[PDB]
Amino acid sequence: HPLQGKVAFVQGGSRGIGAAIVKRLASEGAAVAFTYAASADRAEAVASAVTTAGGKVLAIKADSADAAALQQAVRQAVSHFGNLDILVNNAGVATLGGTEELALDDLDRMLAVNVRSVFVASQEAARHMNDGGRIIHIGSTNAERVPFGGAAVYAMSKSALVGLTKGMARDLGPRSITVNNVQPGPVDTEMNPDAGELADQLKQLMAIGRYGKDEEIAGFVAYLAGPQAGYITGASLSIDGGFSA
Amino acid sequence: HPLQGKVAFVQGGSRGIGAAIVKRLASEGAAVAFTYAASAVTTAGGKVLAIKADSADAAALQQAVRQAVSHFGNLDILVNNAGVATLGGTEELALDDLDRMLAVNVRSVFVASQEAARHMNDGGRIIHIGSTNAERVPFGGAAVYAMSKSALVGLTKGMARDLGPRSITVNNVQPGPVLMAIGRYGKDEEIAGFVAYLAGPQAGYITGASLSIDGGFSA
């Protein structure tokens, strides 16, 4: 139980990678508050995976596009569990579209969720975080390698976290809070399954030859959130099966 | 004991970070052979083997790997932790010091990696110990040292491609001191814990990466 007595906030905790993060932090002893945008049923199943196993949890409905909601969610978490130790920023939106074709609404929604809300959550959490804390953003390997058309805005939204992480590491380093940017490759989820021709084409670009697993992303996040990782800060850390080699 | 039954080779395992890596991998259950700088020492019924070998000597390194495999079978893990740091300006650095940094920091990393790869189980792990000076060189005097460490970035990428069909991962751990965002130097045990994580069964999807553990020196 390396996270015994710690409090974690996960932005986007109800499915895929986020659900795996919430469960793994809880299994290591953390109390976890998480946000979900869409489904109360799904957030219930996540909340039950934590509690049936003995862990403590709070599920908060919050739209990562609304400033006010994330700020509110952070405060509600703090009321419930006390000051934060760990923040994991896992909201994410993907729309494909060429430079000449992408709709401005889609651009706006990727900026709101993938960029703006990462900062806003980070700011509120930092205001309510213990010294010695951990802030982990979930970015993408597309910040480093964009091998196909249609991902310009997505990749922009993710390479944004590189500079955010560096400057936040400077800001919060005097409080011994680390800040890191986890950059996954393709991961097998319901909306991006390891199946079909698209998947095959992505696997071909990867050194390993399979999609990553939610639990593997979770493992790394939990290592970074833990007591051995206090010297890792400012870093963009790829976990992408060699996609970006 | 997530490394129970696994075998590790650590090039440069006798003090500081190397010693911490040896100790951590052994504590997780691995058999560990390491080099330090033919002569070897071990304990009856123990699973740690210390082998005297200069990292500039190609035959001694190849032999050391082969000795490890004789004791313990195919490797699962290699950690390349040898390293020399000589300061000198571009105009002044002695060519023998250039040669020593290339031999130890660069050439012996490939030599050990090649020999390990020939005797390594699929599903294995290769971890190079590089430096954050590959990304940020804030003062004069470190050009050859920085060069020797940024070399490991292209090596890591290309070896990851070579070995990925055998599910062997290859990564480059980049420490900073053991300019700082966090206000302290790193502890050898911290570097070791990151190596141990990458060496273990949860890290099979991490490959080709240069992973900084530097207190934000390079931010």
Author numbering:
A (entry chain A): 5 to 249
B (entry chain B): 5 to 41, 51 to 191, 209 to 249
Give the article text.
SmSDR is a 3-oxoacyl-acyl-carrier-protein (OACP) reductase of the classical SDR subfamily that catalyzes the reduction of its authentic substrate, OACP, to (3 R)-3-hydroxy-ACP, participating in the fourth step of 16-carbon palmate biosynthesis. Each subunit is intertwined to form an α/β/α-fold barrel, of which the seven-β-stranded central sheet is flanked by six α-helices on either side, showing a nucleotide-binding Rossmann scaffold. Two phenylalanines, Phe98 from the β4–α4 loop (residues 94–107) and Phe202 from the α7 helix, face toward each other, thus constituting a bridge structure over the top of the binding pocket.
Given an atomic resolution diffraction of apo-form (1.47 Å), the structure of the mutant F98AF202L was determined to 1.87 Å, showing a clear electron density map of F98A and F202L. Thus, the replacement of the bulky aromatic chain with a shorter side chain at the region of residue 98 greatly led to the loss of the hydrophobic contacts between two arms. Structural comparison of the mutant structures (F98AF202L, F98LF202L, and F98YF202Y) demonstrated an overall homologous fold.
